[PDB]
Design a binder for this molecule. Structure first.
Ligand SMILES: *[C@@H]1O[C@H](CO)[C@@H](O[C@@H]2O[C@H](CO)[C@@H](O[C@@H]3O[C@H](CO[C@H]4O[C@H](CO)[C@@H](O)[C@H](O[C@H]5O[C@H](CO)[C@@H](O)[C@H](O)[C@@H]5O)[C@@H]4O)[C@@H](O)[C@H](O)[C@@H]3O)[C@H](O)[C@H]2NC(C)=O)[C@H](O)[C@H]1NC(C)=O
Ligand SMILES: *[C@@H]1O[C@H](CO)[C@@H](O[C@@H]2O[C@H](CO)[C@@H](O[C@@H]3O[C@H](CO[C@H]4O[C@H](CO)[C@@H](O)[C@H](O)[C@@H]4O)[C@@H](O)[C@H](O)[C@@H]3O)[C@H](O)[C@H]2NC(C)=O)[C@H](O)[C@H]1NC(C)=O
Ligand SMILES: O=c1c(O)c(-c2ccc(O)cc2)oc2cc(O)cc(O)c12
Ligand SMILES: O=c1c(O)c(-c2ccc(O)cc2)oc2cc(O)cc(O)c12
Ligand SMILES: *[C@@H]1O[C@H](CO)[C@@H](O)[C@H](O)[C@H]1NC(C)=O
Ligand SMILES: *[C@@H]1O[C@H](CO)[C@@H](O)[C@H](O)[C@H]1NC(C)=O
Ligand SMILES: *[C@@H]1O[C@H](CO)[C@@H](O)[C@H](O)[C@H]1NC(C)=O
Ligand SMILES: *[C@@H]1O[C@H](CO)[C@@H](O)[C@H](O)[C@H]1NC(C)=O
Ligand SMILES: *[C@@H]1O[C@H](CO)[C@@H](O)[C@H](O)[C@H]1NC(C)=O
Ligand SMILES: *[C@@H]1O[C@H](CO)[C@@H](O)[C@H](O)[C@H]1NC(C)=O
Ligand SMILES: *[C@@H]1O[C@H](CO)[C@@H](O)[C@H](O)[C@H]1NC(C)=O
Ligand SMILES: [Cu+2]
Ligand SMILES: [Cu+2]
Lengths: 344, 343
């Protein structure tokens, strides 16, 4: 009944789960998966999971597609390469480092490879419930000490025979996919923009796209102190998956501004990337979250949040087309900085 | 009074300063500098400064040498290129992204260039007091909202002026040409950068670089698990007499007494990830989050532990056997950024 839990609840309720909590941990070879938000806990709205893993010289999974789930790759720390292709379009790949984002809509072939020793991927998958696949293929991990991954080259995860057998989990093998190997400066093909210029969201649903940290479109909202929304997924890209995804960066709330109360139709969640954010959900205590910590708010439940740190940034997901990030966008203005103004 | 302060104190005392606190802020063009530890606040042991800045197509400073200060570049977030050269050794450069490190000994020519929009560099300079340079070069900033930085010529002093700063220990090197053959964030070719192990320089006076996670590590199991990744040891510091490293931490099991420490030299840390509780001398325990800095005067007892399941701090100590060396010495060589899954 307490707000903070060590594994996501088995039903919809408000909760906070700290970074590297047990969270129904499993390993798949060297990778350790944690399920901070699950299907049961979000009423099937989304999954928010963390994967920690060491450098590997091999792919982290064979190339595959999902026909009914939209996958979102966010780099919390370290780095990992992501490859994706839609239909007939040119195959794209990027090396994501901290704060970088990669969108993989339904029916886009993809795979990834962990580069740096202390790498963390946060996956947001829509709708929720996809994690059964990781329960199934994974091995339960007790991880008493809560170490990020278990200390310790074939492709990780199911072999080619096994991954061709997983249609029930919405996984479909793409064994003809060949990850391109002409990466230079973290990108291929060469005619792309990655850490060198602005990144746009895709013009329509179904196409993969990547946003490097700080380089995507941003909006300043000035209504409750300053907040900068960096959209990753909007209605345009979500369509019938019916969600949004962004980061929200926040200043403190000035003493003359009342911290607003929110209550949305759809469930939402965030994970703190930088800073110290206080969340007050329902009748529970105002609780301060630090890096990697996750807060989950059921639809229809009132909550307040504010940044106790002078600057905080969170990864934010909402079920619905009108969640917090979109509300702040709609109420704000186009903005060209990762910083907010120096004056109120 | 309070352990927490909004600017570094003007004398030595235990303190914490939150990330993006005013910290005597100045701007140099687009860059904003915050002085979390100063000469006065550390009794001249070291300076620890944060620099927040947007992408620039121009150098962040003209190339220069310090004859008396050892400079340490740590990338908190975003990315910046660092160039360095000792003597007639090969000129080295690396693009540092989050958690990466560059070592700039005395008499090493260097410059940097900001790449990513949300870039933060943490400078650790030994000895302390180097900040007087930025008081002269920089313009005071009120920054009422504490924004990281205020929303193509080389940034900072021009060729004339940078040749005029020898009294701050800054010597111009205007003939230095930063090399322009960078590939995958490094040059020359056949350097190792996020693709394999990085060793500390074994020769004093040489620059070196350690990519996040790729340096030597030591596991200490004496008080919970702590992993120390050295960045500067006695080999490199010599008479500058300090150590620098990250320390990663498990929680402290309830069966282990959180140790009380005391060391003759001042030390400090800035939280990079997680949530670290520090109790210094006579003050209340305070929990630190991302970018927060704790300063402990030499000779003052303190305790720390991780409230988070994993935390990582950047740690600097005056003297040759401060906390990080003590943890190494009591620990073992270790090959992982993660600690064991069992106590
Ligand atoms: C992968 O990424 C790297 C970046 O990490 C890319 O590297 C860049 O590559 C381009 C193309 O090769 C280089 O741009 C060229 O630079 C030439 C050399 O420039 C020096 O010499 C000039 C003449 O003597 C001089 O004018 C020039 O100064 C100018 O730029 C300075 C910036 O360093 C600045 O301080 C000066 O005031 C002045 O404006 C240089 O000293 C130049 O002759 C060309 O015309 C061209 O601009 C970049 O310099 C490279 N950058 C780095 C940091 O190495 C690489 O191409 C990427 N690879 C792929 C395949 O994408
Ligand atoms: C900059 O960093 C890049 C990584 O981000 C480096 O890219 C790597 O480049 C090497 C050498 O060119 C590639 O390794 C080669 O790959 C080819 C192709 O491999 C694929 O096809 C074969 C044959 O059908 C198959 O057997 C493989 O499994 C692959 O599917 C091999 O033929 C070579 O023998 C060799 O392994 C890397 O693949 C490539 N990695 C990536 C992720 O693109 C790049 O070299 C760096 N640049 C510089 C100048 O240093
Ligand atoms: O289908 C899969 C998948 O989408 C991903 C994934 C997506 C986002 C993340 O953030 C992390 C992993 O990994 C996998 C690993 C396997 O071993 C087998 C799979 O079928 C998948
Ligand atoms: O001498 C200088 C110096 O060392 C550095 C620096 C070192 C470490 C950091 O983390 C940040 C800045 O910047 C400078 C900027 C100037 O305009 C002028 C200078 O003379 C310096
Ligand atoms: C994905 O592809 C499958 C198989 O062709 C198709 O039936 C389905 O409608 C597609 N889904 C989307 C959202 O494109
Ligand atoms: C992609 O190309 C193939 C030709 O091989 C074609 O059959 C298919 O319809 C194309 N897709 C679209 C969206 O038109
Ligand atoms: C759970 O994990 C352990 C090792 O962590 C493994 O040996 C075991 O088979 C798994 N499943 C069961 C039934 O315990
Ligand atoms: C989108 O989600 C919102 C919030 O959960 C919900 O109210 C709405 O019914 C959804 N729209 C559709 C078409 O499913
Ligand atoms: C740095 O260079 C100066 C000038 O050449 C020299 O006098 C001094 O000894 C050097 N210092 C170190 C530590 O190498
Ligand atoms: C800038 O702040 C400094 C302290 O570093 C102070 O002495 C000085 O008065 C300020 N400069 C101006 C012009 O106000
Ligand atoms: C190194 O610093 C320590 C603590 O500040 C001090 O005790 C000692 O005198 C110094 N050692 C040398 C060799 O100067
Ligand atoms: Cu997938
Ligand atoms: Cu310098």
């Amino acid at each position: 009944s307490s707000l903070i839990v060590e594994d996501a609840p088995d039903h919809v309720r408000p909760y906070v789960i700290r970074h590297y909590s047990h969270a129904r941990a499993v390993t798949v070879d060297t990778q350790l998966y944690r399920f901070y938000v699950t299907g049961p806990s979000s009423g099937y709205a989304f999954t928010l999971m963390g994967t920690n893993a060491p450098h590997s010289d091999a792919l982290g999974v064979l190339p595959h597609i999902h026909q009914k789930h939209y996958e979102n790759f966010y780099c919390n720390k370290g780095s990992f390469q992501l490859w994706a292709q839609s239909g007939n379009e040119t195959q794209q790949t990027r090396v994501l480092s901290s704060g970088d984002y990669g969108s993989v809509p339904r029916n886009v072939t993809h795979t990834f490879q962990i580069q740096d020793p202390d790498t963390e991927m946060t996956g947001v998958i829509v709708p929720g419930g996809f994690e059964d696949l990781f329960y199934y293929l994974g091995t339960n991990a007790t991880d008493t000490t809560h170490t990020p991954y278990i200390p310790s080259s074939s492709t990780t995860g199911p072999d080619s025979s096994t991954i061709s057998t997983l249609q029930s989990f919405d996984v479909y093998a793409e064994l003809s996919f060949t990850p391109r190997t002409d990466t230079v400066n973290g990108t291929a093909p060469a005619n792309t923009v990655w850490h060198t210029g602005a990144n746009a969201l895709a013009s329509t649903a179904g196409d993969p796209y990547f946003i490097a940290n700080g380089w995507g479109p941003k909006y300043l909202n000035s209504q409750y102190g300053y907040q900068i929304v960096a959209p990753f997924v909007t209605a345009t890209q979500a369509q019938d998956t019916n969600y949004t995804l962004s980061t929200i960066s926040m200043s403190t709330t000035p003493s003359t501004v009342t911290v607003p109360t929110w209550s949305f139709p759809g469930a939402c969640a965030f994970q703190v990337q930088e800073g110290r954010v206080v969340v007050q959900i329902g009748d529970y205590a105002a609780t301060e979250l630090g890096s990697g910590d996750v807060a989950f708010i059921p639809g229809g439940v009132e909550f307040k949040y504010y940044s106790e740190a002078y600057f905080s940034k969170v990864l934010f997901v909402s079920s619905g087309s009108d969640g917090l990030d979109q509300n702040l966008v709609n109420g704000g203005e186009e903005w060209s900085s990762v910083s907010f103004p120096a004056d109120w």
